Design a protein around this ligand. Sequence first.
Ligand SMILES: Cc1cc(C)c(S(=O)(=O)Nc2ccc3c(c2)nc(CCCCCCCNC(=O)COCCOCCNC(=O)C[C@]24C[C@H]5C[C@H](C[C@H](C5)C2)C4)n3Cc2ccccc2)c(C)c1
Length: 259
Amino acid sequence: GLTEEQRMMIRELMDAQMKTFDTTFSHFKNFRLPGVSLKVSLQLRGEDGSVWNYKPPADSGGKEIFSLLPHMADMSTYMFKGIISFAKVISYFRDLPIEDQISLLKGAAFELCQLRFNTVFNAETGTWECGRLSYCLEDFQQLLLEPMLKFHYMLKKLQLHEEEYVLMQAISLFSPDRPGVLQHRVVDQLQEQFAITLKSYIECNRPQPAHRFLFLKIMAMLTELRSINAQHTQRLLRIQDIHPFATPLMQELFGITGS
Ligand SMILES: Cc1cc(C)c(S(=O)(=O)Nc2ccc3c(c2)nc(CCCCCCCNC(=O)COCCOCCNC(=O)C[C@]24C[C@H]5C[C@H](C[C@H](C5)C2)C4)n3Cc2ccccc2)c(C)c1
């Protein structure tokens, strides 16, 4: 019930997503593993049927608390590469000046990573199911006090379509107010078009009373996700200051100069 401009925009996004989101994590390899606030266990299922499980340590006032950071840095880096590839496939993004492309990716990389991670989040088991890797929240309502955690549960409950997730990714990517953006007006117009497309998609394909105000719920979540991004970017920089762990790609995305 959309225009073709809107149908072609969704098709392009869905194409970009299909080409650049390794949903089985098959090519995530050669990552570090822990030596032999909220914590996760890590499970690795081998192609032969073997399983390794890692249960994290407790806080004893020592560096043990950072044992998973190298692994997570490798996972995040793998995800960020996918997010960068996604953006670069999209015509509207490719047409932007390269400095704005970089500014938009620096601004949105965390948000797009979290949106992709929500599609592999199992809310029944509190587990991000990443192909052969599984990350399980360690033991309740104290968990939902963490804003990013409550975000994942609340977004999962909306039961969004693939198309709605990829429009969320576009709206986040084309945010006209990230630091360093110059083509503010063009980006702002592109964002509005993606939001209108999402509003119309929901109107045409979700007539049920449960999906009343769904478009507005999604937009409020995107606003909330940007606020969480700012908080978590500061958390990353504090930990990096006392315990370096960011990969080069993470340093580039989060504004660490190397000097
Ligand atoms: C320090 C840090 C910060 C950022 C910003 C990143 S990032 O953006 O570049 N990648 C990333 C990847 C995935 C993220 C993820 C971030 N935020 C989530 C959402 C679920 C968790 C919400 C936050 C919980 C509160 N804690 C923190 O805010 C910082 O805790 C540092 C101290 O750690 C204590 C021991 N806990 C761990 O070792 C486990 C991890 C797991 C993950 C989040 C958090 C920091 C890292 C990465 C270690 C705690 N997910 C979803 C998801 C989680 C696990 C597996 C798969 C998906 C990085 C890399 C690092």
